[PDB]
Amino acid sequence: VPDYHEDIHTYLREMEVKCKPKVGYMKKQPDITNSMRAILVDWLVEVGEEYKLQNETLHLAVNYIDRFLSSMSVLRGKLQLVGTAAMLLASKFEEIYPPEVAEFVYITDDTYTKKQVLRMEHLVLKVLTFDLAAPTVNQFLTQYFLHQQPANCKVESLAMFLGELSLIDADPYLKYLPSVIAGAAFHLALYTVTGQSWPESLIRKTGYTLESLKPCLMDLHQTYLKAPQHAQQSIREKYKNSKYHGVSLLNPPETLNL
Amino acid sequence: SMENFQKVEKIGEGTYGVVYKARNKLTGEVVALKKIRLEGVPSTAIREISLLKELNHPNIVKLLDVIHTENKLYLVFEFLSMDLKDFMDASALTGIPLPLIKSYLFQLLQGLAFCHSHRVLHRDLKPQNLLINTEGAIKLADFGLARAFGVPVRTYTHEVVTLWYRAPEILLGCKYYSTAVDIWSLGCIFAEMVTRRALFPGDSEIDQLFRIFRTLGTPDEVVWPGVTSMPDYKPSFPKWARQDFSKVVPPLDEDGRSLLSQMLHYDPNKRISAKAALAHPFFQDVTKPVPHLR
Numbered sequence: 164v165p166d167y168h169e170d171i172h173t174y175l176r177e178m179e180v181k182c183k184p185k186v187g188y189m190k191k192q193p194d195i196t197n198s199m200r201a202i203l204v205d206w207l208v209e210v211g212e213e214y215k216l217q218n219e220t221l222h223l224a225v226n227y228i229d230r231f232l233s234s235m236s237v238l239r240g241k242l243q244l245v246g247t248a249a250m251l252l253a254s255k256f257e258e259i260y261p262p263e264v265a266e267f268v269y270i271t272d273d274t275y276t277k278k279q280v281l282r283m284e285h286l287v288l289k290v291l292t293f294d295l296a297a298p299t300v301n302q303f304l305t306q307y308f309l310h311q312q313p314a315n316c317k318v319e320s321l322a323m324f325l326g327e328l329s330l331i332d333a334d335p336y337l338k339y340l341p342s343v344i345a346g347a348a349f350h351l352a353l354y355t356v357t358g359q360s361w362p363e364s365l366i367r368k369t370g371y372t373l374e375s376l377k378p379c380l381m382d383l384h385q386t387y388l389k390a391p392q393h394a395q396q397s398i399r400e401k402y403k404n405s406k407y408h409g410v411s412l413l414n415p416p417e418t419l420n421l
Numbered sequence: 422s423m424e425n426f427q428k429v430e431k432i433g434e435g436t437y438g439v440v441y442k443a444r445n446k447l448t449g450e451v452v453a454l455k456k457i458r459l460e461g462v463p464s465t466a467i468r469e470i471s472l473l474k475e476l477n478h479p480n481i482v483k484l485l486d487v488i489h490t491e492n493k494l495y496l497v498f499e500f501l502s503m504d505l506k507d508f509m510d511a512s513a514l515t516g517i518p519l520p521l522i523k524s525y526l527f528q529l530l531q532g533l534a535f536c537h538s539h540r541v542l543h544r545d546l547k548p549q550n551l552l553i554n555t556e557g558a559i560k561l562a563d564f565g566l567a568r569a570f571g572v573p574v575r576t577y578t579h580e581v582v583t584l585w586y587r588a589p590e591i592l593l594g595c596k597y598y599s600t601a602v603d604i605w606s607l608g609c610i611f612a613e614m615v616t617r618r619a620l621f622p623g624d625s626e627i628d629q630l631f632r633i634f635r636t637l638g639t640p641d642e643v644v645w646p647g648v649t650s651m652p653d654y655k656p657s658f659p660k661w662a663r664q665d666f667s668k669v670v671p672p673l674d675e676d677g678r679s680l681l682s683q684m685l686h687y688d689p690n691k692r693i694s695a696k697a698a699l700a701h702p703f704f705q706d707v708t709k710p711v712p713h714l715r
């Protein structure tokens with residue numbers, strides 16, 4: 164299976180640890196809170212749906228946001244500017260055709276100016292020291308998908324839905340690395356649709372077991388259950404679409420048995 | 422600021438920006454400087470910087486610093502003496518020694534293997550993008566068209582690779598392309614090192630396909646499954662026969678020919694990879710000769 168899968172997986176595993184934000188950064192943020200972050204992330208899901216952006220762009224943007232907030236204090240009124248610069252940069256990095264800066268100024272509803280959005284782009288770049296090739300939940304899932312026997316499009320869509328729900332709630336998901344959030348996401352999806360489990364081949368590839376993923380799997384199981392009641396609904400809305408086989412409409416299982 | 426840097430001369434323009442030869446007033450260190458005029462920071466610079474900070478390898482050009490001032494963005498690089506194309510042109514009467522082609526190819530593959538191992542496509546491998554010192558090392562440069570890929574790949578920018586080195590799968594508009602496009606480019610450069618003329622110097626996309634077809638044979642479903650169903654495959658393509666590789670690059674070793682026929686395989690999956698290529702018997706006697714240049 165190419166000749167770089169193992170090398171890349173290994174390297175991605177190394178890189179998630181280095182690209183990890185600080186876990187208790189919100190407790191150090193005087194003016195912003197987990198709930199406000201939830202609002203920003205949810206808004207970016209709207210933005211990505213508006214301009215038909217890749218999900219990868221979304222995860223990158225959230226990574227950038229969290230890493231920036233791990234070192235720079237921000238007031239509530241400016242959090243959205245940070246969010247907008249992140250999305251822009253993520254676009255320039257990941258997308259074949261990113262949107263103009265002009266298009267980004269428009270979706271903030273003329274809160275911020277072009278010059279403001281540009282100067283923030285720099286600030287982020289500088290604060291992140293230009294290191295933008297962060298591994299994402301998404302990057303691991305696509306590798307994990309290769310281990311489906313056989314392939315099931317509903318499993319993939321559900322997995323990516325669940326993985327995308329992890330982006331909203333810093334408590335708890337910030338305490339988990341993407342490769343683990345993806346294992347939880349992949350298993351939960353796989354068990355819901357087909358009633359199958361984390362594959363032994365994925366144990367061989369990743370080193371992770373149901374026992375090791377369980378803590379995250381328990382948390383993600385709760386998010387999935389409370390999702391229709393969640394204050395932020397953009398991701399759920401997105402995944403009703405036929406593009407994602409209406410996976411958000413599916414019934415979550417009530418027990419995992421482990 | 423660049424108070425500490427004195428521009429010596431301009432040296433080129435590639436993909437984006439402009440590269441100057443400059444000198445560190447205080448340390449004495451000769452450097453290369455890429456200058457960027459400031460629609461935000463270009464997507465091409467964002468990629469080149471983050472990826473090149475990740476890629477530290479003797480055969481990949483070292484990025485030393487990133488400086489601002491505004492409205493400019495300076496990239497500071499290790500300096501190198503000559504690009505491959507100028508060196509090939511300097512060797513016009515005398516030839517390039519086989520042990521040096523060997524060393525160079527060996528080094529290039531190492532550097533390509535490093536890239537690919539770190540989910541990175543170069544996408545612009547050409548002799549103007551390959552730099553050499555007096556000590557015998559060759560390095561990959563200009564990561565402007567580079568991009569971090571994922572497993573498995575999705576569709577990327579179709580524009581990529583300068584014409585003469587562009588892989589058939591791009592030319593024929595396959596929806597996915599991978600590491601095999603960098604091998605292709607490297608294969609052409611291998612031939613070009615031996616013959617000192619470009620392998621397939623087309624002027625249009627169709628020209629290129631035809632030049633490739635006249636050398637490697639028009640491909641069919643047997644040699645490359647799925648080819649006649651590709652977006653830019655035309656049934657009206659002339660059906661040329663494949664010729665002996667001995668006539669394509671006449672001076673080459675049996676093992677050279679083997680290596681090359683593998684780097685230029687039509688099927689991207691069948692095409693040998695950089696990693697595997699290093700084990701090829703062509704390199705059994707490989708050393709590190711200096712280029713003897715001025």
Ligand SMILES: NS(=O)(=O)c1ccc(Nc2nc(OCC3CCCCC3)c3nc[nH]c3n2)cc1
Nearest residue numbers: 433434435440453498499501502503504507563
């Ligand atoms: N013409 S030449 O053969 O005389 C000669 C060639 C290149 C260099 N030196 C050199 N050049 C770079 O970019 C060159 C750039 C030019 C345009 C095409 C893409 C590459 C570098 N980038 C990091 N380090 C670099 N060092 C010195 C002499």
